[PDB]
């Protein structure tokens, strides 16, 4: 941990090579075009710029425009803000009926997220069957962590929850560790100890400023194609005017537009299921039955306690990890207006005093759905997304196990001081919303199904093995890759930003190696 970042201002030095997409002088030929300035896309673009000319295209603006994205204290504010089409949080509702969000800003979801930083489960690499260069993976985690990851200071509520997880049997005690391993630990954070948010945009500072250009408010609406090869993109600016840019020689287009954005853009560009695209009168460039298939959202289930004495607000740093459930708790100020998707519907009761949100995440999940187009032409119209929560009975069984463990946690001496009534039972807590039921699995199953929310860690839609090869290339198409959370059908860990930050640079290094 010698290499971890320290407290420091958010580093916006990279703004010297950030330009409005209205600037037609950005149009032309590049070695690489990266679509989506997010978690994977920023480190990918910075890495390729070490040697080659890169254009990074991001549909959102710069985070300085929304200062509440730059502090831990601003987390709920960004979700509370109405979506006017320009804000950093884009609201959506899955076809299941569960409210959700994605980012629309340079730095992507790292600019709006809950800051938790973890390295992938070390079993993940061999589970994928990809021939990873594991030494390089680790160097790459260190390259991310040196810029934006701290060892968190003590926070009273996170310490209470960690003592509770240990008492409840979530063993062993791993102390401070970046690694996804069974037991209870303090993990890293991308909020520093002064509350400053650090994010993927800062990895642009590691790019070569002579080689990297970033266009913001660049809405990429189509991949252009030629042996079938990607050659370029069409993007529009904030005034609505169109622009073109191309790759040259042995260069490549990489889509880093997220679980939602990547499949949407491939489908709009004619890459996807042949009879589906034909149904819409979209000319098929490359038939692939899996584009926008195998889309996953790990369920979040939770209870809320209202202690009779105020608790200190925290960011999540203490994790209770089992193979079948990953648990945390956030302590928060009350909410005067709903932070969209924090609770899964807009009619949920809001807390009027300090509260602990006590959470369990289902691994995998095994349930999957799809991204499909709403508009056959307009990339600014959100696609349809369905997750099919709890369609797979294993997911439901694992939520029941997680909920029973949350019962154990509420029964600890660690949590006893936060009860309203000093009675023997967990009914001595005051709850916001639905409490845990009791004994028989059926009451737990109903609880899991009825009270599900998004964990916000959705993934899939452009999977390795379905849409991509083991080098992240789109099968059948030259000079086209995908690097972002669309690429895997299971989580790398409880909190995947660390993995997708690493993956952007790692695939960049693989591209530069493959090319030399
Ligand atoms: C509210 C919330 C809290 C979270 N908390 C945590 C946490 O604490 N820890 C953790 O590990 N994970 C957390 N996650 C999950 C994690 O942050 C994400 O899974 C990860 O950041 C996804 O990275 P990505 O590169 O796939 O997508 P993104 O980072 O969203 O990047 C995609 C980018 O592409 C841009 N874009 C999309 N379409 C286009 C287009 N057509 N043209 C141009 N640009 C386009 C988007 O604007 C965006 O900037 C959280 C997620 C959310 C939503
Ligand atoms: C953080 O501070 C320590 C000295 O306390 C130093 O050893 C280290 O290099 C600093 N880290 C970074 C990434 O700047
Ligand atoms: C780009 O320029 C337009 C005016 O042509 C302006 O309305 C918009 O806010 C600018 N965007 C950024 C990100 O500077
Ligand atoms: C990579 O780092 C992890 C800890 O994150 C360590 O357990 C593992 O042994 C390292 N692998 C290699 C090949 O260095
Ligand atoms: C902490 O952040 C604030 C901005 O919120 C800044 O005024 C202050 O200088 C920072 N503290 C340290 C110790 O760098
Ligand atoms: C596709 O175009 C054909 C005409 O070539 C038309 O008959 C059909 O209705 C169209 N379908 C859609 C969904 O536009
Ligand atoms: C680590 O990942 C593997 C799947 O490859 C799984 O067997 C194991 O349960 C995971 N461990 C935890 C603690 O999540
Ligand atoms: C587009 O989205 C809305 C929900 O946002 C839905 O009611 C409508 O049916 C969708 N249209 C298409 C063509 O899928
Ligand atoms: C649950 O998903 C797994 C995929 O790992 C599959 O083997 C199992 O058959 C699925 N069950 C249902 C009901 O789809």
Output the known binding site for FAD: 39-40, 58-59, 109, 113-116, 220, 456-457, 496-497
Closest listed ligand to the CA of 126 = 7
Distance CA 313, CA 307 (A): 13
**3-state secondary structure at position 109:** helix
Nearest residue CA, atom 10 of ligand 9?
Answer: 392
Output the known binding site: 39-40, 58-59, 109, 113-116, 220, 455-457, 496-497
Report CA-CA distances (Å) from 336 to 77, 122, 333, 351. Answer: 10, 42, 10, 8
* 3-state DSSP helix/strand/coil % of the chain, to nearest 5: 30, 25, 45
Question: Of all atoms in ligand 3, which is nearest to the CA of residue 216?
Answer: 13
Distance CA 92, CA 122 (A): 33
Per the structure block, which two tokens stand in for 125? Answer: 């690499």
**3-state secondary structure at position 246:** strand
Residue with tokens 């030095």: 13
Which positions ≥6 away from 416 have C-beta within 8 Å? Answer: none
**3-state secondary structure at position 438:** coil
H/E segment holding residue 431: strand 431-432
Report CA-CA distances (Å) from 12 to 18, 34, 189, 214, 297. Answer: 10, 20, 19, 13, 32
Of 185, 153, 201, 123, the C-alpha closest to 497 is: 201
Distance CA 358, CA 347 (A): 20
Of 3, 43, 1, 33, the C-alpha closest to 501 is: 43
Taken as a whole, the chain contains a residue count of 516
- CA 40, 41, 43, 44 dihedral sign is positive
For 44-62, the DSSP string reads: HHHHHTTTS-EEEE-SSB-
Report CA-CA distances (Å) from 147 to 12, 359, 372, 417, 484. Answer: 12, 29, 37, 39, 20
Q: Which of 96, 97, 374, 377 to mutate to test the pocket of ligand 8 (most atoms within 8 A of CB)?
A: 374
Question: Of all atoms in ligand 3, which is nearest to the CA of residue 21?
Answer: 1
Active-site annotation, residues: 457, 495
Distance of CA 139 to the CA centre of its chain: 22
Question: Of all atoms in ligand 4, which is nearest to the CA of residue 137?
Answer: 1
Closest listed ligand to the CA of 276 = 6
Helices (H) and strands (E) in the chain, counts: 10, 26
**3-state secondary structure at position 428:** helix
Distance CA 278, CA 460 (A): 23
**3-state secondary structure at position 502:** helix
For 247-265, the DSSP string reads: EEEEEEEEE--HHHHHHHH
**3-state secondary structure at position 76:** helix
Vertex 141, ends 135 and 147: CA angle to 5°?
Answer: 140
Distance CA 75, CA 456 (A): 14
Q: Which of 293, 364, 388, 392 to mutate to test the pocket of ligand 9 (most atoms within 8 A of CB)?
A: 392
Distance CA 321, CA 317 (A): 13
Residue with tokens 């295209």: 57
Provide the experimental method for this PDB entry.
X-ray
Does ligand 5 have an atom closer than 6 angstroms to the CB of 67?
A: no
**Gyration radius from the chain CA atoms:** 22
Question: Beta-carbon neighbour count of residue 499 at 10 Å?
Answer: 25
CB 231 within 8 A of CB 14: no
Of 359, 374, 161, the C-alpha closest to 264 is: 374
Does ligand 7 have an atom closer than 6 angstroms to the CB of 277?
A: no
Domains of the chain, by residue range, sit at: 12-149+195-297+367-389+455-516, 150-194+298-366+390-454
Report CA-CA distances (Å) from 511 to 352, 482, 515. Answer: 52, 12, 6
Q: With helix as H, strand as E and coil as C, how does 208-230 read?
A: CCCCEEEEECCEEEEEEECCCEE
What burial letters (b/e) apply to 407-434, b meaning 16+ CB within 10 Å? bbbbbbebbeebbeeeeeebeebbbbeb
CB 170 within 8 A of CB 321: yes
- CA 101, 83, 357, 452 dihedral sign is negative
Pocket of ligand 9 (CB under 6 A): 366, 392-394
Residue 256, Cβ density class (10 Å: 0-12 exposed, 13-18 middle, ≥19 buried):
buried
Distance CA 93, CA 341 (A): 9
Distance CA 335, CA 121 (A): 34
């Amino acid at each position: 941990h010698h290499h971890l970042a320290n407290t420091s201002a958010h580093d916006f030095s990279y703004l010297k090579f950030v330009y409005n997409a209205t600037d037609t002088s950005l149009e032309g030929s590049y070695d690489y075009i990266v679509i989506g300035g997010g978690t994977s896309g920023c480190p990918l673009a910075a890495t390729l710029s070490e040697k080659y000319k890169v254009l990074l295209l991001e549909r959102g603006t710069i985070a300085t425009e929304y200062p509440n994205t730059l502090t831990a204290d601003g987390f709920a504010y960004n979700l509370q803000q109405q979506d006017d089409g320009k804000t950093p949080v884009e609201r959506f509702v899955s076809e299941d009926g569960i409210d959700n969000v994605r980012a629309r800003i340079l730095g992507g979801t790292t600019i709006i997220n809950a800051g938790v930083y973890a390295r992938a489960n070390i079993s993940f690499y061999s589970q994928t069957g990809i021939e990873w260069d594991l030494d390089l993976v680790n160097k790459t985690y260190e390259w991310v962590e040196d810029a934006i990851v701290v060892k968190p200071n003590n926070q009273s509520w996170q310490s209470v929850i960690g003592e509770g997880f240990l008492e409840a049997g979530i063993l062993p005690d791993n102390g401070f560790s970046l690694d996804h391993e069974a037991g209870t630990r303090l993990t890293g954070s991308t909020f520093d100890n002064n509350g400053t948010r650090h994010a993927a945009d800062e990895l642009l500072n590691k790019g070569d400023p002579n080689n990297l250009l970033v266009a913001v408010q660049a809405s990429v609406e189509k991949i252009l194609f030629s042996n079938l090869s990607a050659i370029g993109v069409i993007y529009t600016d904030s005034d609505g005017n169109s622009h073109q840019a191309f790759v040259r020689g042995n260069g490549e287009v990489i889509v880093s537009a997220g679980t939602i954005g990547t499949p949407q853009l491939l489908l709009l560009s004619g890459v996807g299921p042949e009879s589906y695209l034909s149904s819409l009168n979209i000319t098929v460039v490359q038939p692939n039955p899996y584009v926008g298939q195998f889309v996953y959202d790990n369920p979040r289930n939770f209870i809320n306690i209202l202690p009779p004495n105020p608790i200190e607000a925290s960011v999540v740093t203490v994790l209770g990890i089992r193979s079948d459930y990953y648990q945390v708790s956030l302590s928060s100020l009350p909410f005067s207006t709903p932070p969209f998707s924090f609770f899964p519907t807009t009619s949920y009761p809001l807390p009027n005093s300090t509260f602990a949100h006590i959470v369990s995440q289902v691994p995998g999940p095994l349930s999957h759905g799809s991204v499909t187009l709403n508009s056959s032409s307009d990339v600014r119209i959100a696609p349809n997304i369905k997750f099919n929560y709890y369609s797979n009975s294993t997911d439901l069984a694992n939520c029941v196990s997680g909920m029973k463990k949350l019962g154990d946690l509420l029964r600890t001496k660690a949590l006893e001081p936060y009860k309203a009534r000093d009675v023997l039972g967990i009914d001595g807590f005051n709850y916001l919303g639905v409490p845990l039921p009791q004994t028989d699995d059926a009451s737990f199953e109903t609880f899991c199904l009825d009270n599900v929310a998004s964990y916000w860690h959705y993934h899939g839609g452009s999977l390795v093995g379905k849409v991509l090869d083991d080098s992240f290339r789109v099968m059948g198409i030259k000079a086209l890759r995908v690097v972002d959370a669309s690429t895997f059908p299971y989580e790398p860990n409880s909190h995947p930003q660390g993995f997708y930050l690493m993956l952007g640079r790692y695939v960049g290094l693989q591209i530069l190696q493959e090319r030399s």
